[PDB]
């Protein structure tokens, strides 16, 4: 009947409204089209109404894309192509009606909503930051919900949206006029006789109805300088555009994404061939690349992506408004660069003036590029900058309520630093620290308050990567943890909570990968080759760039830290030579040039350590580093690193550097199987017998009795 969609008569115009009170946001589903069908036919069975308009009367987004648990609802190939052939037949119903129609946008329209949007004759949008217009198609790796890519370049153009529909990234409503998808804009309103946002969703109805009567008697026309140069001009440059794109997609990424080129063949065949006949090619394509081993776990990645952008600890009690960043440098000014714009007062501690110049010139230089790309106004830029004051000694920590240490890592100096920066701080505070190596329970037994100390570890370029990690002692209260993760998600960076251990999670898994980055050049296979060799498997940055990523000075400490405990037998397993690297005094990224450098070779030919021989090709050493990485990534939760490990590699792929289009280190028991990797290291069984030894929990349900982790 009318369970989610309804209209009425006002101005003799059908105001069909979109709402779904069950979830917070509305999703395109079979359960929505099952009633969205038998309304427009009644609109098409009417004659008094001469124009109609649809809108999402629920505040927030417009609609979702494909509903996350419905395309991931497992069904066989003929039905998943039947639904994705039926799903646009209802669009080819309404896109060419005799009675014209108008849609509207006042939200983050994403996914199949453009299918609803640009099929219309005339859409209308609201200029604000909340409304964005993007196509999450390649980001989950598919083709869209009804195949709108066969009328996007009819509308805006092949080269115009060809860098849109597979770049993944969204556009705000401001550039959409200069692009040409939506044509008219209307800015929202402030105060009303009704609350100051409910009128703005009820304002568009009347702007739509004053467009609507004009469409029926044609006072305005829907026929609304670089694309005009293209607009008729492709008789012969045909191959000489998508060939440039054919090698573009494999120079940006590497060739082991079989997803995005499989939307190119659409727009390759949509031009020059049968356009209406082209609407059934993707029916033979959408069922392929959804039922494949490329993006099958990518849906689970998205479930975890939305699943950890949640508070998850009760309710936030006594929210923070001030910060206290102990120490300038690269993390402190770094996390200040992100924790300043969206309403957090910060104070940035330094030792002398001589490093605040290196301080604020991050939080300014990485800020005005933001206004150089016109993503902010020129004025609000500077209020955002002036929310950040930099003290010198101490005057103002009596007002602070949350403290984050940022000093370069040591067990001895910070042990004192927590003892002198305890007295001028109130008792309802939070102390926290971004240690990377040494644990907090070794330093949580010193201060006056035992329970108001957590840990927050960041990652090194703080702007581009997008996650935090929490360090939780025995003594962390629920209010302390909730108040921490409030800063975590108000920060915007997707959180994961970790019960600690000697070496917590990320360096805990990175050093048993980094300790064999020396092992390829331990024989001397020209590790410039290794960059291509490992980016071929899928890692976005090479292992040479990983050791040029971590900083050469902390590499000896993250070698000695768990090597103090158990890193000599299976948190490592090769002779350390990085102290010989720094014996000359190489400086890493601050030396600018990386590794030919003419001095790595003298290390190995110092004394003849590589007479070694084993059949280890490139694929062999790729799976050696990956299988040890997943041996450690399955070692976690065997001691109970957290509650349930399906929360795991939402962290461990998203800042660690693990490739997407590979499901995660906790996700190779499923599409690659524990049986096959145990055959891989059982092929590797007689090599050393010491370091690569597999864990016991995954191995007992590995091969025969078809068991999985949770599936």
């Amino acid at each position: 009947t009318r369970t989610h969609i309804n209209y009425g008569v006002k101005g003799d115009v059908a105001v069909v409204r979109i709402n779904s009170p069950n979830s917070k946001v509305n999703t395109l589903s079979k359960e929505l089209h099952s009633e969205f069908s038998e309304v427009m036919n009644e609109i098409w069975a009417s004659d008094q109404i001469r124009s109609a308009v649809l809108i999402s009367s629920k505040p927030g987004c417009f609609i979702a894309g494909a509903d996350i648990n419905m395309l991931a609802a497992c069904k066989t190939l003929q039905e998943v192509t039947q639904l994705s052939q039926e799903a646009q037949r209802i669009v080819e119903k309404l896109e060419k009606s005799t009675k014209p129609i108008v849609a509207a946008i006042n939200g983050s329209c994403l996914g199949g909503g453009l299918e609803v949007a640009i099929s219309c004759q005339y859409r209308i949008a609201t200029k604000d930051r909340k409304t964005v217009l993007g196509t999450p198609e390649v980001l989950l790796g598919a083709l869209p919900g009804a195949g709108g890519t066969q009328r996007l370049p009819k509308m805006v153009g092949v080269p115009a949206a060809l860098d849109m529909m597979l770049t993944g990234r969204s556009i705000r409503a401001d550039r959409a006029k200069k692009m040409g998808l939506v044509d008219q804009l209307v800015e929202p309103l402030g105060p009303g006789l009704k609350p100051p946002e409910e009128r703005t969703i009820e304002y568009l109805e009347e702007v739509a109805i004053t467009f609507a009567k004009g469409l029926a008697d044609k006072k305005i026309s829907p026929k609304r300088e670089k694309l005009t140069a293209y607009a008729m001009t492709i008789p012969f440059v045909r191959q000489q555009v998508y060939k440039k794109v054919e090698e573009k997609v494999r120079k940006q990424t590497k060739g082991l994404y079989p997803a995005p080129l499989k939307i190119i063949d659409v727009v390759k065949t949509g031009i020059e061939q049968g356009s209406d006949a082209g609407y059934l090619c993707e029916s033979q394509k959408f069922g392929e690349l959804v039922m494949t081993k490329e993006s099958k776990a990518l849906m689970g990645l998205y479930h975890g992506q939305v699943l950890c952008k949640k508070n998850k600890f009760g309710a936030p009690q006594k929210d923070v408004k001030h910060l206290a960043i102990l120490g300038a440098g690269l993390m402190g000014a770094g996390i200040a660069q992100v924790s300043v714009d969206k309403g957090l007062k910060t104070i940035l501690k330094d030792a002398t003036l001589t490093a605040l110049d290196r301080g604020q010139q991050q939080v300014f230089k990485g800020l005005n590029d933001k206004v150089k790309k016109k993503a902010l106004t020129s004025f609000e830029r500077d209020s955002i900058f002036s929310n950040l004051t930099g003290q010198l000694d101490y005057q103002g920590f009596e007002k602070a309520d949350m403290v984050i240490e940022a000093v370069f890592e040591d067990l001895s100096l910070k042990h004192r630093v927590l003892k002198e920066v305890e007295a001028v701080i109130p008792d309802h505070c939070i102390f926290a620290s971004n240690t990377s190596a040494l644990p907090i329970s070794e330093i949580a037994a010193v201060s006056k308050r035992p329970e108001k100390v957590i840990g927050m570890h960041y990652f090194s370029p703080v702007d581009k990567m997008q996650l935090l990690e929490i360090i939780t002692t025995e003594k962390t209260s629920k209010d302390t943890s909730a108040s921490a993760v409030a800063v975590g998600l108000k920060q915007g960076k997707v959180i994961i909570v970790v019960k600690d251990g000697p070496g917590f999670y990320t360096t805990r898994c990175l050093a048993p990968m980094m300790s064999e980055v020396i092992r390829i050049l331990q024989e001397g296979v020209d590790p410039k080759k290794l960059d291509s060799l490992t980016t071929s498997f899928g890692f976005p940055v090479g292992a040479a760039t990983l050791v040029d990523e971590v900083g050469v000075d902390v590499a000896k400490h993250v070698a000695e830290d768990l090597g103090k405990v158990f890193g000599e037998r299976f948190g490592g397993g090769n002779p350390e030579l990085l102290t010989q690297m720094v014996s000359k005094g190489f400086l890493g990224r601050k030396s600018g040039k990386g590794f030919l450098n003419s001095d790595m070779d003298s290390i190995l030919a110092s004394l003849k350590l590589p007479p070694k021989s084993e059949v280890s090709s490139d694929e062999d050493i790729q799976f050696r580093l990956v299988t040890r990485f997943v041996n450690e990534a399955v070692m976690c939760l065997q001691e109970g690193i957290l509650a349930t490990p399906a929360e795991g590699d939402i962290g461990a792929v998203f800042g660690l550097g693990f490739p997407p289009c590979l499901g995660g280190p906790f996700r190779f028991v499923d599409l690659y199987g524990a049986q096959k990797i145990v055959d891989r290291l059982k092929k590797y069984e007689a090599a050393y017998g010491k370091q690569f030894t597999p864990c016991q929990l995954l191995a007992d349900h590995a091969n025969s009795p078809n068991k999985k982790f949770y599936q």
């Binding site: 008219q184 309103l189 105060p191 009303g192 006789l193 304002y203 004053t210 467009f211």
Partner: protein
């Protein structure tokens, strides 16, 4: 009750001309001098008794800063009279009177001149941010400063956009207009009124706060120009300019670029009765408040008025004669519509109901803004005599003047009748 009182005396206003007529020749401190000499023409005051003149601009013609100093020296004042300008966006004058009454009630001086003077005919189009670095030029260093050059000559424009939100007056105008349910027909009944009364006001010819002077370049005299009446059907055809044609603010029912000046005199009451000039009004309390320029940009007056009624200790409906300042049609009826209901005093302060009820009859009868133009920083120092001679003309004894400014500041002050 022991604070010294304070008095408005006769308020000279040179008439307002739409830009492009005879004030396109002038110099932005000259009709200051004209209005001030006209003040010294009908006041008969010795020119050495006038104590502390203060003006107010918005443009600040930078060949001569602090306009009031030489603009008093030009009219032959005794130069033992200090002066300063006061620059706000729109209620510059009518910030002049309030700092003057603060200067008087401190009890140190004698009399104040307050005036507001501007010309939007010659807006300042300045040269660039970086070509003016060739000020370093003013024999090889003269070359080497000139050595670095590409084509970056572009005069940057003083786009009147309030800079806190980077958008012009009209976007916020029709936002607040459409937000409080204003139709196009209801928005122009007031536009019809604000000329239909104005032509009758000039017809009877008792709006007599006008001196003439001669423009030195062009021919004869001046008298106000922005008055034209029309019908409602001859207004809705005008396609709106501030936004795409779905919106509801056009150039017919909207302010226009006009130029002019104004002045008055403000006296202590005891010397007003000692010398013997017949006054016009007292000048009682004044609230002075601002609004956050993201939401309530031009919700100027009607967030300020119930803060001044309780300040004086009286009630709304028992006022005798308003006059609210306008800058757009509809804005003033949105400043009728919003506070003739609940929900808006609610949630933007605590627990009042309907504290704005202007009964529309005792409103802007001698046509306010949109009638004879809106100078950008000189209204207000029209408006006080347009309250004073008005409420003398009928009965009544009190009346509030309130105005809105580009930037969120409001202004509101009550004016009492003649002390006899």
């Amino acid at each position: 009750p022991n604070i010294r009182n304070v008095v408005v005396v006769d308020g000279v206003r040179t008439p307002f001309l739409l830009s492009g007529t005879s004030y396109k020749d002038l110099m932005p401190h000259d009709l200051a001098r004209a209005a001030l000499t006209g003040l010294l023409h009908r006041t008969s005051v010795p020119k050495e008794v006038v104590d502390y003149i203060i003006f107010g601009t918005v443009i600040q013609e930078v060949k001569t800063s602090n306009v009031a100093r030489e603009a008093a020296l030009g009219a032959g004042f005794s130069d033992k009279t200090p002066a300063h300008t006061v620059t706000m966006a729109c209620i510059s004058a009518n910030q002049a009177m309030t700092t003057g009454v603060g200067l008087i009630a401190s009890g140190q001086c004698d009399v104040i001149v307050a005036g507001g003077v501007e010309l939007m005919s010659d807006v300042p189009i300045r040269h660039s941010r970086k070509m003016r670095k060739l000020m370093l030029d003013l024999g090889q260093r003269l070359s080497l400063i000139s050595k670095f050059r590409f084509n970056f000559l572009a005069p940057e424009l003083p786009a009147v956009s309030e800079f806190s939100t980077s958008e012009t007056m009209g976007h916020s105008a029709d936002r607040l207009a459409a937000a409080f349910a204003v139709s196009r027909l209801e928005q122009d009944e007031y536009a019809l009124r604000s000329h239909s009364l104005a032509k009758k006001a000039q017809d009877e010819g008792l709006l007599s706060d006008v001196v003439p002077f001669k423009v030195p370049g062009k021919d004869t005299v001046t008298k106000d120009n922005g008055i034209r009446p029309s019908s409602l059907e001859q207004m809705a055809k005008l396609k709106p300019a501030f936004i795409k044609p779905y919106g509801t603010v056009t150039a017919a029912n909207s302010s226009f670029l006009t130029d002019g000046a104004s002045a008055m005199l403000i006296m202590a009451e005891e010397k007003a009765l000692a010398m013997g000039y017949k006054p016009k009004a007292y000048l009682r309390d004044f609230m002075y408040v601002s609004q956050d320029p993201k939401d309530q940009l031009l919700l100027g007056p009607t967030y300020a008025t119930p803060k001044v009624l309780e300040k004086a200790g009286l009630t709304m409906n028992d006022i005798d004669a308003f006059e609210f300042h306008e800058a757009f049609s509809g804005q003033i009826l949105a400043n009728f519509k919003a506070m003739d209901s609940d929900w808006f005093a609610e949630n933007y302060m605590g627990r009042k109901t309907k504290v704005g009820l202007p009964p529309l009859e005792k409103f802007n009868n001698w046509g306010g803004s949109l009638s004879l133009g809106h100078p950008f920083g000189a209204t207000g120092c029209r408006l006080v005599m347009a309250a004073a001679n008005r409420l003398r003309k009928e009965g009544g004894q009190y009346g509030l003047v309130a105005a809105c400014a580009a930037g969120g500041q409001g202004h509101a002050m009550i004016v009492e009748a003649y002390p006899k």
